[PDB]
Amino acid sequence: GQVTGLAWTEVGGDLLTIETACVPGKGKLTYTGSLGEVMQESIQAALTVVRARAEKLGINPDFYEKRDIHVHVPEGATPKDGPAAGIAMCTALVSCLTGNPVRADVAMTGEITLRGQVLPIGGLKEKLLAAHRGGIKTVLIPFENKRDLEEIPDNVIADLDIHPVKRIEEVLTLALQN
Amino acid sequence: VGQVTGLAWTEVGGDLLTIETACVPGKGKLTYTGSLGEVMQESIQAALTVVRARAEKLGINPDFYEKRDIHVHVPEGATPKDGPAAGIAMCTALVSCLTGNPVRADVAMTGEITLRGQVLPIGGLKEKLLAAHRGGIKTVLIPFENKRDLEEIPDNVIADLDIHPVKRIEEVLTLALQN
Amino acid sequence: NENRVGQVTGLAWTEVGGDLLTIETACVPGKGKLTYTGSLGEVMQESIQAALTVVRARAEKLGINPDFYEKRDIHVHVPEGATPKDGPAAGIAMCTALVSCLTGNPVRADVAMTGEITLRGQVLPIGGLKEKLLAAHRGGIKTVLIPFENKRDLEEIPDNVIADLDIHPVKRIEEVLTLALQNEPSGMQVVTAK
Amino acid sequence: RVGQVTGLAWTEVGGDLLTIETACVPGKGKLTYTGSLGEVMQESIQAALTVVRARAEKLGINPDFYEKRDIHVHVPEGATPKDGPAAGIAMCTALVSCLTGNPVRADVAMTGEITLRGQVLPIGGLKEKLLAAHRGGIKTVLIPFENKRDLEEIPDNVIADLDIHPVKRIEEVLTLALQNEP
Amino acid sequence: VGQVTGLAWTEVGGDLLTIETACVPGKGKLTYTGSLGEVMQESIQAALTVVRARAEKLGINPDFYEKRDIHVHVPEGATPKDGPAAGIAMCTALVSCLTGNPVRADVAMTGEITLRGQVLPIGGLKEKLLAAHRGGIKTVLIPFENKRDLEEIPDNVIADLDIHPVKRIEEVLTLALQNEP
Amino acid sequence: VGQVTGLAWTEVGGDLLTIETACVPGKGKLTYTGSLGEVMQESIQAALTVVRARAEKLGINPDFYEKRDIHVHVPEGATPKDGPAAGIAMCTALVSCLTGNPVRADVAMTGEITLRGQVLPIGGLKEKLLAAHRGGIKTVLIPFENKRDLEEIPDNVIADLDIHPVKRIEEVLTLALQNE
């Protein structure tokens, strides 16, 4: 129920620790963390991808009738917005609802869609620089951000194991431990 | 999830958009997202009402809404968008979702939808068809009263595109759904 | 005919002027919900709520089952979607459309109407009558229902408008419905002979 | 007429004759308040309803009407902004009227702020209110008791034509205004 | 219906206020009206919580907040009020309403209430106690920590007043309710 | 019991907060009042999710979220309060309230809470501990990473407080509550 994402904050692209809790409940979605509206919408999108694909994910199709879900992104006081945490949100929800832990030294950036495709984001360099400083080994980026890998310093590309992904299935396969 | 390429006004970039609609286990909740302005939001409601009103003839359970939640999402999520032009795409995406009847990926569409299922003309036909052309789209559905606006579209664009002027939502679904 | 159920031409204010409104209503299976859209200003939204109350208050006379109603969702929409509409002048049109939608009673072709609705069923005069009638005249509307108290305002509207339009001044909503709908909405028909 | 009360209160064009309408059709307890009402006027409706709820058994009204009835209070004309607490007793009267089927008298107008205790509080702009009523042909006007001192600042010709009843409590209001005794 | 004379901030200034409270058959819904500002609104919620958390001690059927609907109104409806200083009045009014224990007519009170039932000091004590006096109020309840603020108000005003500094809500209710809570 | 002294940001008056909570039989309504800023309101949501996640190990009945109404109030009511520093205090108060477990006297605490139960560093530590000291707080729990900031603080202040740098919410409940 914890994933490292790369997304926009008040001070630039950054490592975010995305948290999701899925305690027994009645189907309420709470999300907090000084989130802007586009980031809030990415969470609804990510939840809908899970609900639509629940059977595929070994999750009870009616799980949202018996679960309350809280997505929180610290630091609580730092403003964050944008769609780039989309695949991280989805991954955290799948982890939480399945009990399948998330890989330690992995981070990810990318906008999610209901169809499960992963869309390119902006400020990739800033994002990959943030993951490099944090000692992140593996980074998932959208397939269409490959062109942007040119602007990145050679030493950072060399240190990072970067995976361009097209689809959410790819993301879950790489990020989850099982 | 249902999936349809629409042409509708966006604040930045092109007017070519993927209208997405999921119809998951739920209890009759509608969610709509995608940096949508109010007129676009209201077209989602109108589109959903069209399906609800024609559910039996469409091959859908009239009481589907009791046991389904609907999310309508229009990527790219941060791109501000507005207007009624994605209406027929929304209706198509919702019929696809609730029947499991795939949409032709080589077809895009534009047009305002009415509760009577009629397709109304839209503005910026040129903006839209250039996006459809540059987006590699082969077939475009447009409103019937927009036919006279085709006279101001570049010849190559007219040459490349298979434009189909439509009047009614029945025409749209026949032209866009695979079965 | 089926296409005439829940479709009413009102005359109210738009961002272009006091023009024609094609007022749409669907009554689909549901749970008692009312939705209204079409870039409506707040005064117009309140007219729709007044109009539905009027219907609900006269449901027995109108033959609308209270329980069927509670298992319907209602959606009033006024295209074109992007054009701002406001004012209380679509009140009787809204009520007509709702009665039509809920009872499967098609609205007569080539009728338009204008008038503010009250909860007591009274039809109150409206403003900009001249421009509304220019709007009806321009759209080949033949029969226009107006408030009985706007009758004095007919004098400033040219002869041909009055020669072309069939104007029926109305006092109450029961009259509107009888004039606007295909079948008589309120009451079983009794046939008598002298 | 059941559910209609003539009230005097402020509008954007001044303290004018108001026709307060209420409908109470069977529902689930929904409360709709329309007519370009300002927030203070909206709060007066909620106060008026509370007064009625507390006196429900005393008024012959089934106590659990707040759960089995939908109530819609509307004040034409829809486009004219109305505000203030002066329609309070009129809101209560129309509300009691509707829920009991007890017709309101057409020759009675009324103004006054209502409290949950059912007390009638003095209001403002009494001059405009009564001049309005007088041009409107109203025979009888109920005013707040503490507003009697304001009567001496309105023309003698207007007041002589009016049957003015100063009221202190809501039950007084109801007995003068309802066709049958509540 | 409960009624209490509170002293609290109004648009015109700190003044005499009749806090009303009705408690009819209901499903546990809370209504507050009277042009109340947000801090005054939260004071009502704080006051209600005190009563719920102390219900049986107050002799109130603990399950009252699913059997009762509550409306707190403060006339005059058009006069903007705000602040936490009517909190102990709100709570007195609720307790009176839910118990039928009349509140004395010669008593006015001012004070912020906490969930623990503590009375916290308030501002504008001068203008508050002047209003009480002008209204012919006999006894006034103020927060204990407002005692030194009494030395800034005219001695002629204060000498006419029976001033009771309180620390806790049980003092308020014992001093203000006509029968013993 | 349900009463916790937390140190967090205020517009005026000391950075000391008295956090009160009530947990009565109910249908599951959360009320939070006290002129609370959005970030502080969110901190309450987070603290409550923590408690829910750990309800069973905390001896709280799992279905409290639907059998209980909870009102979190922070006096003085007209004093604006904001920020995340009251997070661990909010959690402690809720646990104390739902368990009947009293909080230890003269304990205060500052710290941002995460859903996983990690205590995050805060700002204005100096002002916070000055308020603790004048409040006669003896024991203060701060975030482990605020240890660096203790260097910036007067010697007499450091002297009279029993300052405990904590990493997790388990240390916080152990140091703050009178029972387990």
PDB file of N, CA, C and O in Angstrom, chain F residues 11-32:
ATOM      1  N   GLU F  11      -2.113  31.083  14.462  1.00  0.00           N
ATOM      2  CA  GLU F  11      -1.874  32.444  13.994  1.00  0.00           C
ATOM      3  C   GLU F  11      -1.483  33.363  15.150  1.00  0.00           C
ATOM      4  O   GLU F  11      -0.584  34.187  15.021  1.00  0.00           O
ATOM      5  N   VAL F  12      -2.161  33.211  16.281  1.00  0.00           N
ATOM      6  CA  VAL F  12      -1.828  33.957  17.495  1.00  0.00           C
ATOM      7  C   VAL F  12      -1.893  33.049  18.703  1.00  0.00           C
ATOM      8  O   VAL F  12      -2.560  32.016  18.681  1.00  0.00           O
ATOM      9  N   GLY F  13      -1.220  33.457  19.773  1.00  0.00           N
ATOM     10  CA  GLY F  13      -1.124  32.640  20.965  1.00  0.00           C
ATOM     11  C   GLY F  13      -0.083  31.561  20.752  1.00  0.00           C
ATOM     12  O   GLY F  13       0.359  31.324  19.618  1.00  0.00           O
ATOM     13  N   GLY F  14       0.306  30.903  21.837  1.00  0.00           N
ATOM     14  CA  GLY F  14       1.379  29.926  21.780  1.00  0.00           C
ATOM     15  C   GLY F  14       1.110  28.841  20.764  1.00  0.00           C
ATOM     16  O   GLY F  14      -0.037  28.614  20.382  1.00  0.00           O
ATOM     17  N   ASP F  15       2.169  28.172  20.321  1.00  0.00           N
ATOM     18  CA  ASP F  15       2.023  27.072  19.381  1.00  0.00           C
ATOM     19  C   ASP F  15       1.539  25.824  20.112  1.00  0.00           C
ATOM     20  O   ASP F  15       1.626  24.720  19.593  1.00  0.00           O
ATOM     21  N   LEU F  16       1.042  26.004  21.330  1.00  0.00           N
ATOM     22  CA  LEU F  16       0.483  24.895  22.080  1.00  0.00           C
ATOM     23  C   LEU F  16      -1.004  24.720  21.781  1.00  0.00           C
ATOM     24  O   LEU F  16      -1.770  25.690  21.755  1.00  0.00           O
ATOM     25  N   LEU F  17      -1.400  23.470  21.570  1.00  0.00           N
ATOM     26  CA  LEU F  17      -2.778  23.134  21.283  1.00  0.00           C
ATOM     27  C   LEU F  17      -3.323  22.135  22.288  1.00  0.00           C
ATOM     28  O   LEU F  17      -2.679  21.146  22.613  1.00  0.00           O
ATOM     29  N   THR F  18      -4.521  22.399  22.779  1.00  0.00           N
ATOM     30  CA  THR F  18      -5.226  21.418  23.580  1.00  0.00           C
ATOM     31  C   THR F  18      -6.248  20.715  22.692  1.00  0.00           C
ATOM     32  O   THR F  18      -7.249  21.301  22.297  1.00  0.00           O
ATOM     33  N   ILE F  19      -5.979  19.456  22.374  1.00  0.00           N
ATOM     34  CA  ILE F  19      -6.837  18.681  21.496  1.00  0.00           C
ATOM     35  C   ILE F  19      -7.819  17.835  22.302  1.00  0.00           C
ATOM     36  O   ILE F  19      -7.428  17.050  23.160  1.00  0.00           O
ATOM     37  N   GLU F  20      -9.103  18.024  22.026  1.00  0.00           N
ATOM     38  CA  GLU F  20     -10.152  17.308  22.721  1.00  0.00           C
ATOM     39  C   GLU F  20     -10.872  16.451  21.723  1.00  0.00           C
ATOM     40  O   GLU F  20     -10.978  16.809  20.558  1.00  0.00           O
ATOM     41  N   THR F  21     -11.360  15.309  22.181  1.00  0.00           N
ATOM     42  CA  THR F  21     -12.123  14.407  21.337  1.00  0.00           C
ATOM     43  C   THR F  21     -13.227  13.794  22.175  1.00  0.00           C
ATOM     44  O   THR F  21     -13.056  13.588  23.375  1.00  0.00           O
ATOM     45  N   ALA F  22     -14.363  13.525  21.541  1.00  0.00           N
ATOM     46  CA  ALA F  22     -15.434  12.768  22.168  1.00  0.00           C
ATOM     47  C   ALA F  22     -15.821  11.654  21.212  1.00  0.00           C
ATOM     48  O   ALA F  22     -15.826  11.861  20.003  1.00  0.00           O
ATOM     49  N   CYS F  23     -16.112  10.476  21.760  1.00  0.00           N
ATOM     50  CA  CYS F  23     -16.476   9.299  20.969  1.00  0.00           C
ATOM     51  C   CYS F  23     -17.723   8.655  21.551  1.00  0.00           C
ATOM     52  O   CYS F  23     -17.642   7.766  22.391  1.00  0.00           O
ATOM     53  N   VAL F  24     -18.881   9.105  21.097  1.00  0.00           N
ATOM     54  CA  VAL F  24     -20.147   8.612  21.610  1.00  0.00           C
ATOM     55  C   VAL F  24     -20.756   7.611  20.648  1.00  0.00           C
ATOM     56  O   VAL F  24     -20.427   7.615  19.464  1.00  0.00           O
ATOM     57  N   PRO F  25     -21.638   6.740  21.157  1.00  0.00           N
ATOM     58  CA  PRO F  25     -22.434   5.862  20.294  1.00  0.00           C
ATOM     59  C   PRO F  25     -23.053   6.640  19.140  1.00  0.00           C
ATOM     60  O   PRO F  25     -23.654   7.687  19.363  1.00  0.00           O
ATOM     61  N   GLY F  26     -22.888   6.149  17.920  1.00  0.00           N
ATOM     62  CA  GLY F  26     -23.413   6.852  16.766  1.00  0.00           C
ATOM     63  C   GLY F  26     -23.480   6.013  15.501  1.00  0.00           C
ATOM     64  O   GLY F  26     -23.454   4.784  15.546  1.00  0.00           O
ATOM     65  N   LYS F  27     -23.569   6.693  14.363  1.00  0.00           N
ATOM     66  CA  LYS F  27     -23.712   6.028  13.082  1.00  0.00           C
ATOM     67  C   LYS F  27     -22.445   6.199  12.272  1.00  0.00           C
ATOM     68  O   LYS F  27     -22.324   5.673  11.172  1.00  0.00           O
ATOM     69  N   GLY F  28     -21.495   6.945  12.819  1.00  0.00           N
ATOM     70  CA  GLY F  28     -20.203   7.089  12.180  1.00  0.00           C
ATOM     71  C   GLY F  28     -19.937   8.454  11.591  1.00  0.00           C
ATOM     72  O   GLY F  28     -19.373   8.561  10.505  1.00  0.00           O
ATOM     73  N   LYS F  29     -20.341   9.503  12.297  1.00  0.00           N
ATOM     74  CA  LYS F  29     -20.071  10.853  11.825  1.00  0.00           C
ATOM     75  C   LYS F  29     -18.783  11.379  12.420  1.00  0.00           C
ATOM     76  O   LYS F  29     -18.589  11.320  13.626  1.00  0.00           O
ATOM     77  N   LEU F  30     -17.902  11.895  11.571  1.00  0.00           N
ATOM     78  CA  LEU F  30     -16.703  12.574  12.030  1.00  0.00           C
ATOM     79  C   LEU F  30     -16.946  14.081  12.016  1.00  0.00           C
ATOM     80  O   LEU F  30     -17.300  14.653  10.989  1.00  0.00           O
ATOM     81  N   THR F  31     -16.782  14.711  13.177  1.00  0.00           N
ATOM     82  CA  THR F  31     -16.860  16.165  13.297  1.00  0.00           C
ATOM     83  C   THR F  31     -15.501  16.687  13.764  1.00  0.00           C
ATOM     84  O   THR F  31     -14.929  16.161  14.706  1.00  0.00           O
ATOM     85  N   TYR F  32     -14.968  17.690  13.077  1.00  0.00           N
ATOM     86  CA  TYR F  32     -13.772  18.367  13.553  1.00  0.00           C
ATOM     87  C   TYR F  32     -13.861  19.889  13.456  1.00  0.00           C
ATOM     88  O   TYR F  32     -14.123  20.454  12.390  1.00  0.00           O
TER      89      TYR F  32
END
